[PDB]
Amino acid sequence: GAHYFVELTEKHLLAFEMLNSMCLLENYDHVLLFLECQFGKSHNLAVIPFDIILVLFTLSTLSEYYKEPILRANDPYNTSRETLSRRALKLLQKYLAILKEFDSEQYNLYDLELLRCQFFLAIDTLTPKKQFKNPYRSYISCLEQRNTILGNRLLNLKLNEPGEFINMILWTLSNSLQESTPLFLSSHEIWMPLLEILIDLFSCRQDYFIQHEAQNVSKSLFVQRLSESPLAVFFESLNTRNFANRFSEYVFLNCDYKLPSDNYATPVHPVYNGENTIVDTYIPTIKCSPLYKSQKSLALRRKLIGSCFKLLLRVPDGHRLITPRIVADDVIQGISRTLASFNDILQFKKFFMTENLSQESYFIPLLAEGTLSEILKDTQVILTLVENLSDGVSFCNEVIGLVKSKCFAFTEQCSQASYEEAVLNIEKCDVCLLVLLRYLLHLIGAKEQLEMLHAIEKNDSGRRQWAKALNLGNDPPLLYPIVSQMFG
Amino acid sequence: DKYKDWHFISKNCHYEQLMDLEMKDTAYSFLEFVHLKCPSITNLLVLFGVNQEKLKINYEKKENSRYDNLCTIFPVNKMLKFLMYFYSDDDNDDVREFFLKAFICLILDRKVFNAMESDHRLCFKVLELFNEAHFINSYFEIVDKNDFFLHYRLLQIFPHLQSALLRRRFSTIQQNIIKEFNEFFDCKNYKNLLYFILTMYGSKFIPFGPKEYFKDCILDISVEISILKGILNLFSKI
């Protein structure tokens, strides 16, 4: 322990000891109130010790949907009209959004650094092992004599088991679209929120590890270290030689894709006993439409894919990493294959219809150009869209060629029998081109677009007529009206 | 008491109609123009099952202590994204006041409070539209006495407007705070006294620490009282 460890002062030692003593008596209500009753005040930033961040991570897994009696027996009065899991998650999110904003115009330049060390002393105790280290010798933390928080064992104890960190990911990725009450719930109020927190911590611990290492080193050593990086030990849990096919099938685990591998993931078991069961007293009140579930699920999956691409585009043009055995050049093909070979148009939009068109860059246009260069291959070229994201003319001057080579226009090889599959394929291309064009304008702020515009509008005729050639009651999925508006 | 909160939303939300409105918005947001379904903000509210054609808690009518009624609610982020289409920044004040009151009433009830996203984006973005002095001057229409059970809630949602919220309630100002501590201890209004404690503690008037002479009083007043003693001990040991 040499880097990122900051010693506390006499002001923070009393806070740490009082918090640990309050936790020792199982008085978690006051442990939450201590941190909550001083958040929006003067610049002090009462920081949580890591031995309490772990208790928070374990409390946050005590959702009221399956454990009502334990929560209701902990604190009968419930003055806040809330539950420990709902509160613990709020505090975690609050301190995490604080950690992601290291500004000196806020609480302190030392308490912030004392939080950054306290959140990094907590994710280090969670090592992705393939399917009590206390640095503060000033107080007796309440994790020496306690391995169970109201029934739930712990977070680092339950994830450091043989092949348990990967079941925690593959067990929340399949209940995020569930149409059942306990399953979806468990992956809505517990692991979906928690998994976005963790991924948010590894994605900055990796930044600490990368920005604070050995400046100016040889590629051989540089890339040899990248396999020892925080994130790299997180990707290891996948335990697969063939990343390209494993990862891609592990990311989308309940989508409607082609399913080419019958040997799918084993039926995943819940992390905690009773997680997949609803208690009789609790009655849910939210009506989550399937569109909402698909939106949340695809948001989490896109976050995982970005967290992947975080270290995979770090490896230089030299040798590939040795620890994860990731290629970083054809894993895009594997993911863009599962997107093109889909069967639902709603889920295909919600993946690319992202809310943060800037926070998740650098891999959506690479995944947008990867699906556009895979549907054409299997259904009627060397594209350069992703390379032309720095020239308004270039990308505009190459889109004509496609539409002019019967790219997005229907073929005559099929009939009116398989019109759907013939319509979906051109409907999937609509979604992919828009995204590529939407990024263009946004990343770039004459007749070039004019020419392209006309072409797109003149290509609609075929579809329109194609609606009459197959005697349709309505029209086909046009791609002119949606584009015209975009250009303003 | 149990689930005795404000409960703005009285009936079930028009699921199918809302779902319909939920579509045509993802590509819209990623790429209001569609307002033919619900023309006005009153229509948008009643679509949420908000109210049988209602914006002020009638405490004489016991509106501040309702029942469960086991009613369903649409996702709160969708609610606050639909409600923020009828904003009309450049419009009259008699409609913007209705918009603000509708937002405040549908942020204080238990359903929207106990069913909220862990990270708040919409709640802070909506409040940022109005003025803090205007949000708290045209305050959440609760009486000043029972202003504290709902003020603790408003401070749980938005914690930055606490000093800017005791001024409008008490108008140094610590004499009023100490006098209002009485007539709560003089009466048996301990619950409202507890929430008054939880609302005022930590401000510029009643800071934390060992140092306010409330502890002595409580020690002399001695099942809802114990919690007061514990919270006071905790706040003194800070």
From Swiss-Prot, chain A:
One of its GO terms (molecular function) is ATPase inhibitor activity. InterPro entries: DNA_repair_Nse5/Nse6. It is found in: Nucleus; Chromosome. The keyword Nucleus applies. One of its GO terms (biological process) is regulation of telomere maintenance. The keyword Protein transport does not apply. GO terms for cellular component: chromosome, telomeric region; nucleus; Smc5-Smc6 complex. It comes from the Eukaryota. Its main location: nucleus. Keywords: Chromosome, DNA damage, DNA recombination, DNA repair, Nucleus. Pfam families: Nse5. Present with 907 molecules/cell in log phase SD medium. Acts in a DNA repair pathway for removal of UV-induced DNA damage that is distinct from classical nucleotide excision repair and in repair of ionizing radiation damage. Functions in homologous recombination repair of DNA double strand breaks and in recovery of stalled replication forks. Component of the Smc5-Smc6 complex which consists of KRE29, MMS21, NSE1, NSE3, NSE4, NSE5, SMC5 and SMC6. Interacts with KRE29. This is Non-structural maintenance of chromosome element 5. It comes from Saccharomyces cerevisiae (strain ATCC 204508 / S288c).
Swiss-Prot record, chain B:
The keyword DNA repair applies. It is found in: Nucleus; Cytoplasm. Keywords: Cytoplasm, DNA damage, DNA recombination, DNA repair, Nucleus, Phosphoprotein. GO terms for molecular function: ATPase inhibitor activity. Disulfide bonds: none annotated. Its main location: nucleus. Transmembrane segments: none annotated. Component of the Smc5-Smc6 complex which consists of KRE29, MMS21, NSE1, NSE3, NSE4, NSE5, SMC5 and SMC6. Interacts with NSE5. Acts in a DNA repair pathway for removal of UV-induced DNA damage that is distinct from classical nucleotide excision repair and in repair of ionizing radiation damage. Functions in homologous recombination repair of DNA double strand breaks and in recovery of stalled replication forks. This is DNA repair protein KRE29. It comes from Saccharomyces cerevisiae (strain ATCC 204508 / S288c) (Baker's yeast). The gene is KRE29.
